[PDB]
Amino acid sequence: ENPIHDRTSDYHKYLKVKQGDSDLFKLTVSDKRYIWYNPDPKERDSYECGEIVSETSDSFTFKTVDGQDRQVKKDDANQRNPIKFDGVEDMSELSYLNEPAVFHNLRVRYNQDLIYTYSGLFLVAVNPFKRIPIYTQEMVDIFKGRRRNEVAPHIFAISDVAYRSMLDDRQNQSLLITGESGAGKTENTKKVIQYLASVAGRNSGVLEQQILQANPILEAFGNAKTTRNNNSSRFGKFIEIQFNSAGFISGASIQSYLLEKSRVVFQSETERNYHIFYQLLAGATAEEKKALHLAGPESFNYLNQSGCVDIKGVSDSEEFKITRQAMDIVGFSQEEQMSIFKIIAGILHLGNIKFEKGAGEGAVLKDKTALNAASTVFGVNPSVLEKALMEPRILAGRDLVAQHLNVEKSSSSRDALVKALYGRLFLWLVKKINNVLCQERKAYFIGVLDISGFEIFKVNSFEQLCINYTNEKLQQFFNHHMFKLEQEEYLKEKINWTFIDFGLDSQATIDLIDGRQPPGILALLDEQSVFPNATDNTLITKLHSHFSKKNAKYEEPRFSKTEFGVTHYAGQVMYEIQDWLEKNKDPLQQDLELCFKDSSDNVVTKLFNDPNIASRAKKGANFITVAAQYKEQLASLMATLEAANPHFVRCIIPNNKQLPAKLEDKVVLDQLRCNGVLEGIRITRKGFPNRIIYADFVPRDASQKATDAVLKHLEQYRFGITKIFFRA
Ligand SMILES: [Mg+2]
C-alpha cells in the first residue's frame, strides 16, 4: 500500500486522476448548475455545456455558448454532474446518468490516458491506440489480491476478481470481452492471460510461459490487416485457463472458431493476407528462400493484389523471429516448422498457377513453373495434381466420369485446395498446442472469449454475417444476465420489485438468422445448399419472399438485387449473396484430397489422413454445412458460458482512424447505446446486486430475522423469501 497511496509512484501517475489545482477547487465549490444541450438540434451526439440561469416548476432555462437563451422541459434535460464527479472511477456514483454525462466522464478520463472505467459491475475500456505503461510486472503485483474498491479500474482488477470468485465460490468463471473491430479485445485478452499466468503461476514454471507463447503463434496465421484493424483477428477463440483445487494453473485449452480462410486467396484493397505470408518472405534465410523457390510478396498473386504489403510500424522480418521463438517454446520440431513453411510457400505457388482456355472449352496449363514449385515443396506428383485440378473424376450414378473444368472452375478448385490446406493447418496448430497444454485434469477454469467483432465493409459476405451474428448473441448474453435473469431473481424471491423494460432485446434479429421453425436465413441457406438446381439468385429470391415486408429486422433493398439487409444491434448491414452456396457447402474435389494423401511430407499427410483434421461429419447423404457446423459449436460455447459466472469488459473504439488522443463524439456514443452501458448502470443502482442465503446471512445459529440484528448494530435494503439483498 506504499505505491497505492504514494503520488510519486507510477501507479498514481498512470492509473489515477491528477490532482486538481487551486483554480479548479474554486469551480468545484461553485453553486452554479449546468446542462448538456445540442447546439445543432439534429446533430444529436455533439453537445456543449451551458449554465442554468432560471427554472420553472417543469422547465430549465440555460445559456448557450453564443449568449442566446434556450428552454428545455425538466423531463428532457441532460443535467451536467458536478465537476467533482469528473474522472470518477465508477459511474454508478454519478448523480445524473445521461448519455452526454457518461461520455463526458470517459472523455475526462481518456484525456489523461485513463482508459479503464467501471460502469457498475462491468468494465469499460476505451482503446488508446498508444502504448501506456500500466501492464508491467510491478503493476501486476500491486493489483494482486486487492478488492475492486481498493484499487483503480484495470483489466488486472477484474481478472483478479474472477480469480478470487473462482476460489471463494468454487465455480468456473468467464471473462467476456465485447467490442467492434479495432475496439481493444485481443490486447485486453493478452493482459488477462498475463495476469492469471503470474498470480496463479508456479515459481520451473515453463507451462506458464508455454501458455503465453501459444497466442503469438495463432496470431501469425490467424490475424491480418483489414481496413478497421492492422492486427484483426480473423478467427474467434475461447481460451480456457485451468486451475487445480489449490488454485494454481494446471493447464489450458484453446477452442478456435470461424477462420476467414477466404482471405488466403482474396483481400479487399489496402488489406493484407495473413501475417505469416509476409513474415516468411521477409525473415526467411537465403537458404530457406532458395529451398522453397520464394520471391518478394510482389511476385505472388495472393499477395500482390490489394496494393499493400506493409503495416505502419511493423517489421515482418522481426515478427517472424517472434513466432519461430514461440514455436520453439511450445515444442514444434525443426522439421515441423519447416513443413509448416513448405505449406505456406506451397500455398503461394498454387496461387500463381494460371489456367487458360485450351482447344476446347476445358482449361489447360501452358506454364507449369508454379505447379512444379508447389508440388516440390508439398511433395506430391505434379501431373497428378494437374489432372486433379482441371480434370477431376466424379461419379455419375455409379459410373466414373472425368471432368474437364474451364478456366473459371479450375481456378476455383485451386482456391478450394488452398483454403482446405490453410484451414487444416490452422486446426493442426491449435491441436498441437492444446496437446502441449493438456497436462492436468482441471478443477476449475477461467474462460476468456476473444471473438472477431462487429464489422462492416463496402462488400459484406457470408463471413461477415457469421461474425456479426456471433456478436449479436454475445450482446444478447449481456442483456440476458444483466436485466432478465437479474429481475427474474427479484421477482422469484418476492422483494416487491416492479419489472423494468430496458428495451434491449436482440432476439428478433437472432431468430431471423438462426431460426429453425419458422426457418431463418441459415436454415433457408442450408435448404438451398442441397437443392440440386439452386443458384445464388434462387437463394436470395427465397430470402426475400420469406422475410421482405414480413420480418421487421430484414430489408429487401430497392437499389440492388443481390444484397439484403439485416438490422443488428450495432447497425444495419447489407450482405452480398454471391458465392454463398459454395461457401456453405465448402466443396473440394476428392481427387485433390487423394493426391495430397500420397504426399512426402509428414505434416501434409496428417492434414489429409487424420480423421479429426480431414474428415467432415455427414448429415444423411450430404456433408454437414458450414452454417450448421458453426451453429453447433456456437451453441456448445454459449452453453459453457451460461454455466460459468460472467465478467464483462466492454471495449470501445474512440474513432475510425486508429489514431490516439482523438475521442470522437458520435462514434463512442453509438457503441454506448447499442452495448447497453447506461442500461447496465441503471440496473445496478436501482436494483440490488447481491444476495446471500439466510442461514449464512452475534449468536451464529438459529428464522429469517436472525440476521436482522447485525444490520441494526451497524427500504435501503430488502428481505425476500430465502435470501437477503443489498443495494449500492
Ligand atoms: Mg482481435
Residue numbers in the entry: 1 to 203, 208 to 701, 712 to 716, 719 to 730, 735 to 748
What does the primary publication say about this deposited structure?
The ATP-driven mutual interplay between myosin and actin drives muscle contraction and many other forms of cellular motility, including cytokinesis and directional cargo transport; yet, our molecular understanding of how these two cytoskeletal proteins communicate with each to generate force still remains incomplete. With the aid of mutant analyses based on kinetic investigations and simulations, we identified the W-helix as an important hub coupling the structural changes of switch elements during ATP hydrolysis to temporally controlled interactions with actin that are passed to the central transducer and converter. A critical role in controlling the sequence of events associated with force production appears to be played by the W-helix, which we propose to act as kind of communication zone in the inner myosin core for coupling conformational rearrangements upon nucleotide binding to cleft closure-induced β-sheet distortions by putting a stress on β1 to β3 of the central transducer; this is important to temporally couple weak-to-strong actin-binding transitions to the initiation of the power stroke and release of hydrolysis products. To gain mechanistic insights into the proposed role of the W-helix/transducer region in mediating actin binding to product release, we followed a mutational approach and replaced the two hotspot threonines in the W-loop of the myosin-2 motor domain from D. discoideum by either two alanines (AA) or three glycines (GGG) in order to reduce the rigidity of that region during weak-to-strong transition without dramatically disturbing the fold of the protein.
We crystallized the motor domains of the mutant myosins M765AA and M765GGG in complex with ADP∙VO32− and solved the atomic structures of the proteins to a resolution of 2.60 Å and 2.55 Å, respectively. The superimposed structures reveal that the mutants crystallized in the pre-power-stroke state adopting the same overall conformation as previously reported for the wildtype. Characteristic features of this pre-power-stroke state are the partially open actin-binding cleft, the up position of the converter, and the relay helix in a bent conformation. The active site elements, switch-1 and switch-2, adopt the characteristic closed conformations and coordinate the nucleotide together with the P-loop. The nucleotide position and nucleotide-binding pocket are conserved between wild-type and mutants. Only minor structural deviations from the wild-type conformation can be observed for the mutants concerning the β3, β5, and β7 strands of the central transducer, which are slightly shifted, as well as the relay helix conformation.
